[PDB]
Design a protein around this ligand. Structure first.
Ligand SMILES: OC[C@H]1O[C@@H](O[C@H]2[C@H](O)[C@H](O)[C@H](O[C@H]3[C@H](O)[C@H](O)[C@H](O[C@H]4[C@H](O)[C@H](O)[C@H](O[C@H]5[C@H](O)[C@H](O)[C@@H](O[C@H]6[C@H](O)[C@H](O)[C@@H](O)O[C@@H]6CO)O[C@@H]5CO)O[C@@H]4CO)O[C@@H]3CO)O[C@@H]2CO)[C@@H](O)[C@@H](O)[C@@H]1O
Ligand code: MG
Length: 540
């Protein structure tokens, strides 16, 4: 039983029973495990693009192939063991020893690590992949050598890591099927050194069956910090005093690229020209206008987030010449040309060989906005003679399907989140290593194959970010492939849905006090939601 006034209720990113706290398995780890319990070398702030020293006191390129971080002094694990450069060293090297660890690939371009003292980590690279390194700096959680030292690979990969031993502001406290509770670690080093202190003694991650349940909670004042997508925002504000980031439409910040992955290995979705017909048959205007009531922004064909630093590298002419539009008559014309015609007379087009075509289109149950969006896509596909069947599995099955590539059509925003480089977006789309993976956690979920994308991805990755002309050119070349082969169809920019109320906690960020990115998704707490905790004030 938790004291209400000492407790902040968060919801929006827990859609399965909390059952994993393993920093090595971020796809299964309960939201907050990284960020609240395990710490990263840097914070990252999507509002500004700034990296802010967390564990790292500083991080610099000494030269084009050498990166050095100097840790802050006085960092400790929760069990009072000093956190040192060897902890950081270990974090990387355990993956060279055990290649099954998802980030073992870094050693294909990381040559070795030096630690001239216990605060200093020096990375020397065989092949410096800058864009990817930048992201590692704020996404790779640092783990305790003295805890994991003598575990084998199966233990590391398969353990649940209950009551994870970290260095961060919180510990795991308790949980059940419907919530995860974090309790503030009072002797946190972060407070002694950085002078910050997360205001709630307890953070509860609330799991809910569907978005509609969360709204009732908010109206009852039982959620404080909500990332659920909820309708009727003007009314929520006026009638129920629930607040959003912006006072006016679109009300929410934009955080992701929402679109459709297609199974590139299942006929007829294996056909580029069929994928194109699908893209041209979909009109997002009623999704944007009616499902979201103007609370999201519609995507252009390339799908670069308008509020992101990717725009700095926008390949404008490529999009103009190769982008698609909603054009259902041309979609039908393409389908006729390919031989996809109705031969039994039920209004659906068959294969040229005369065989029926039925494609499932799926999203998680309870994501009410995507379920509605999926049905308008279904109705829009029906009208060009394409039989799409909506399917809303449990979130856990939705993600298993995604990783395994066991889907026909799939609504997706997994890895397309805002970032410091358009490389994340293209990697999520094209991720070549998916073709030789049972489980693809990184992207390319529909197993799209292309002989030139891997080289393009790498060339982009090793191009210094300040080389605008070259990064732009490479985004152009990659965008050109995306636009012509459409393995992923961008539709709109997902809202960073963020609704709060002030009955228990106040001083939330918004457009008038825009101090932190409000995202409590797994792996996102170090992008701002932790900083919000630092800044919250109890209500009077
Ligand atoms: O509106 C619908 C519905 O929305 C809900 O809110 C959703 C929202 O819609 C999104 O769907 C969101 O999705 C999140 C997701 O929950 C999770 O937080 C996700 O984390 C990403 C990271 O952002 C990052 O991209 C990460 O990439 C890693 C990768 O997966 C590998 O693990 C890792 O290993 C690499 C290695 O480092 C090498 O660099 C590389 O070459 O290969 C290795 C492995 O091959 O590499 C990176 C670094 O770790 O992946 C994770 C997991 O994908 O981010 C997405 C957003 O992009 O979820 C929200 C919460 O559910 C709610 O609002 C509903 O109410 C609403 O109805
Ligand atoms: Mg037919």
């Amino acid at each position: 039983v938790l004291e209400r006034n000492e407790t902040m209720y968060y919801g929006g990113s827990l859609w399965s029973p909390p059952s994993n706290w393993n920093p090595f398995t971020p796809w299964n780890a309960v939201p907050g495990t990284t960020g609240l319990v395990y710490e990263t070398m840097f914070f990252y702030d999507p509002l500004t693009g700034n990296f802010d020293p967390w564990l790292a006191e500083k991080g610099e390129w000494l030269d084009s192939k050498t990166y050095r971080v100097v840790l802050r002094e006085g960092i400790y694990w929760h069990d009072n063991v000093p956190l040192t450069s060897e902890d950081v060293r270990f974090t990387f090297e355990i993956a060279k020893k055990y290649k099954g660890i998802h980030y073992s690939s870094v050693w294909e371009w990381l040559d070795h690590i030096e630690t001239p003292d216990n605060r200093t980590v020096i990375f020397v690279f065989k092949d410096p992949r800058y864009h990817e390194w930048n992201e590692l700096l704020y996404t790779l959680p640092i783990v305790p050598k003295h805890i994991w030292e003598e575990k084998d690979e199966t233990t590391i990969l398969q353990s649940s890591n209950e009551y994870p031993l970290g260095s961060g502001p919180y510990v795991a406290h308790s949980w059940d099927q419907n919530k995860m509770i974090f309790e503030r670690f009072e002797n946190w080093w972060g407070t002694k050194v950085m002078g910050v202190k997360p205001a709630p003694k307890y953070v509860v991650i609330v799991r809910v069956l569907s978005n509609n349940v969360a709204l009732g909670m908010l109206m009852k004042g039982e959620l404080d910090f909500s990332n659920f997508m909820l309708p009727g925002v003007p009314i929520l504000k006026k009638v129920y005093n629930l607040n959003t980031w912006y006072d006016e439409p679109p009300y929410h910040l934009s955080s992701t690229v929402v679109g459709l992955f297609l199974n590139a290995r299942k006929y007829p979705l294996s056909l580029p020209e069929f994928r194109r017909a699908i893209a041209m048959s979909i009109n997002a205007d009623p999704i944007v206008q009616r499902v979201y009531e103007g609370a999201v922004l519609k995507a252009d064909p390339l799908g670069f987030l308008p509020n992101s630093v990717w725009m700095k590298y926008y390949p404008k002419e490529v999009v103009e010449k190769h982008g698609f539009k909603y054009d259902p008559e041309e979609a039908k014309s393409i389908l006729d040309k390919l031989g996809f015609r109705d031969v039994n007379g039920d209004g659906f087009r068959e294969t040229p060989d005369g065989k029926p075509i039925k494609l499932t289109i799926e999203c998680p149950y309870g994501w009410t906005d995507w379920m509605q969006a999926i049905q308008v896509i279904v109705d829009q596909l029906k009208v060009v003679g394409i039989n799409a069947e909506p399917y809303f599995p449990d979130s856990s099955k939705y993600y298993e399907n995604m990783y395994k590539g066991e889907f026909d059509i799939e609504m997706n925003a997994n890895g397309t989140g805002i970032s410091s480089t358009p490389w994340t977006y293209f990697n999520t789309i094209f991720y070549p290593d998916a073709l030789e993976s049972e489980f693809s956690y990184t992207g390319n979920y529909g197993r799209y194959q292309n002989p030139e994308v891997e080289s393009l991805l790498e060339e982009l990755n090793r191009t210094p970010l300040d080389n605008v002309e070259k990064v732009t050119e490479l985004c152009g070349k990659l965008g050109e492939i995306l636009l012509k082969d459409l393995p992923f169809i961008p539709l709109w920019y997902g809202a960073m849905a963020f609704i709060t109320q002030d009955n228990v906690w106040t001083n939330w960020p918004n457009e008038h006090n825009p101090y932190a990115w409000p995202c409590g998704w797994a792996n996102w707490w170090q992008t701002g939601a932790l900083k919000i905790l630092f800044n919250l004030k109890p209500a009077k």
